[PDB]
Design a protein around this ligand. Sequence first.
Ligand SMILES: [Ca+2]
Lengths: 241, 241
Amino acid sequence: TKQITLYTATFSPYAHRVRIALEEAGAEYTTYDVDILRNMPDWFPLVNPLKKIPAMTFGGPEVPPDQPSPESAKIAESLAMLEFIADLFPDAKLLPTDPVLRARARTFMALYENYVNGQFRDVWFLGTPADPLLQALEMLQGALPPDGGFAAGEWSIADAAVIPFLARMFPYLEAGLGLYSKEDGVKMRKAMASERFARIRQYVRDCRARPSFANTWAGDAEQVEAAKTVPMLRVGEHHHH
Amino acid sequence: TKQITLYTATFSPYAHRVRIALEEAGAEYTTYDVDILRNMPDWFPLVNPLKKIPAMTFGGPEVPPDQPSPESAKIAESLAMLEFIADLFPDAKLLPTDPVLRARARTFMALYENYVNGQFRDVWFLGTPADPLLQALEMLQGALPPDGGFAAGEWSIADAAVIPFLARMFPYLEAGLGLYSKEDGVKMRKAMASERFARIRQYVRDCRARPSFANTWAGDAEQVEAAKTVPMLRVGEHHHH
Ligand SMILES: [Ca+2]
């Protein structure tokens, strides 16, 4: 019965995580776009003082999202939101019930956060060399069950945490968006198409085929256009060597 | 009933997290020290292919920790291990049961991970400026309940996640451990003693007063000596900005 409002932005993989989870949960919820990188509304720090998307309000009186209530719980940090949605909707089985399988999900989310995400950021925002990112992606790929399935076997929030980033990689590379050079772009495109990365390609197809992805993705071309609005992606700019 | 083995090192705040949680759970468990920074045993990648401490094995036959079994589950990443211990020992109430309070715990862990931990690492190991670390610590302090108590009210794994780092800060500063400049050491010592940080000092005292801390801490001087064994804490080197 308690309302959920998610403050979102199409470009944001962090917001995308939470939309996927809410879809998989069958939740009733509102989304409200915020132009966080270019024109943040003066009320936005009332929902998230960190001034980041996503933000979430929970409960309180039903109010317009641009008039947030002080009575709603304010929840920050996308991974905390994923665990919250799992806790709110236990019948949706957004995590396994077995402790070891649950730990596979948590480990996969930590491997992504601690080893992969920062490599994506370095390559895309600074144009650092692509090899350490490919190495990190090969490590993450090796944590998947080789013969098929999601991170913990059955789909879980671990897959919501990771697919937004992997799904953006392919179309962003095809558009040449990000500070890496053409040489490294070609290298990453060839690597991600090679047998070395067949398993992570299967993973991306499997996550993308679910309605939770279809219903929260604008389309590859539209997602690229939204990403070009991100100041830190510096459309038209590339660093070399 | 299944065995728990935690591969540990006294200097490591990451391993310390998990020891605290195991104590709070009342678990039966084995610890085994690993000289991971100077002399990693050849068998260690069998328990953690990432070659990091902590490592955990769960179940399988009872074997000496230096003879790990292929049959035990290998669990990596300290925050995944914290959630695993909470899942294995529900009667110990290592997380709240209320979803919003659980989300406070997960948010606190994410705030620490995403904003504070990298600042501690960069100030101590690279000598980067201390002001962003102090700003991150003030933000984390602001997430605590103002009147006392732990991150989510009652003690939870969020406090296990954070106290190893905060508890090391004070004696490390007094011993002059770290690559930051003298000026920044003075700044940090004065700040951490100032009224600005009264709330986090109370938090550290409250977490340290619990048996789970006392029984997993070697003593301030002993912890300082263990930290001096860390190669990246190069004695006699300082960076200046
Ligand atoms: Ca506050």
